[PDB]
């Protein structure tokens, strides 16, 4: 039988807490600070480099904007159309979600990394150039 005086945590998952400022036998009077300066009573900010013009005002801005209308696409390679579907059949946008290779409520796009032998028949948005030649080379077809 397992009772509550037989349960114990895994060896190493509960290590003791470092209580600091409690004697010369441990981290003593200064509690790991030592100094007599800003570090001994306050915090120094990260953005501050002692006065000179910092690392984020010497280097210039990264060039250019971000597109407000960049319609992205999700990605499934043609090498995982093979392994997930080893006997062919229709490959819609819906069945790729349930097999776990693409996200819900997004747009799919089949790329061409890998080898394809099974006669798949995939429907998607906006196929690659190298995916219409690894699918039609196995009797498949690529619709919209």
């Amino acid at each position: 039988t397992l009772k509550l005086h037989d349960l114990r945590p895994a060896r190493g998952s509960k290590i003791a807490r470092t209580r600091v400022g409690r004697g010369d036998g441990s981290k003593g009077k200064t509690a790991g600070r030592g100094t007599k300066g800003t570090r001994a009573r306050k915090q120094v900010p990260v953005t501050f480099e002692g006065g000179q013009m910092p690392i984020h005002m010497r280097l210039p801005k990264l060039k250019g904007f971000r597109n407000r209308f960049r319609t992205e696409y999700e990605i499934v390679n043609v090498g995982d159309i093979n392994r997930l579907f080893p006997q062919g059949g229709a490959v819609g946008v819906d069945d790729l979600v349930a097999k776990g290779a693409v996200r819900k409520n997004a747009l799919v796009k089949v790329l061409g990394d890998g080898k394809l032998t099974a006669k798949v028949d995939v429907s998607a948005h906006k196929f690659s150039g190298s995916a219409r030649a690894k699918i039609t080379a196995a009797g498949g077809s690529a619709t919209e």
Binding site: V46, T47, I55, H56, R58, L59, P60, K61, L62, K63
Partner: protein
């Protein structure tokens, strides 16, 4: 109390595909007459942020 990222260093540092931090190079905005073309060309592109200043740039983007 949700942690803010630094609003200026996110315009001067971006990330590549393997966790590197890249940036641009200076001395290329103005006064470009007396700079020959073997100097304006060295300052083109993007370099990896140096190995001694990668802790203060991680803790500004994050």
């Amino acid at each position: 109390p949700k942690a803010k990222t630094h609003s200026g260093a996110s315009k001067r540092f971006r990330r590549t595909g393997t966790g590197k931090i890249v940036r641009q190079k200076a001395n290329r905005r103005h006064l470009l007459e007396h700079k020959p073309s073997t100097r304006t060309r060295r300052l083109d592109g993007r370099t990896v942020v140096a190995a001694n200043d990668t802790k203060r740039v991680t803790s500004l983007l994050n």
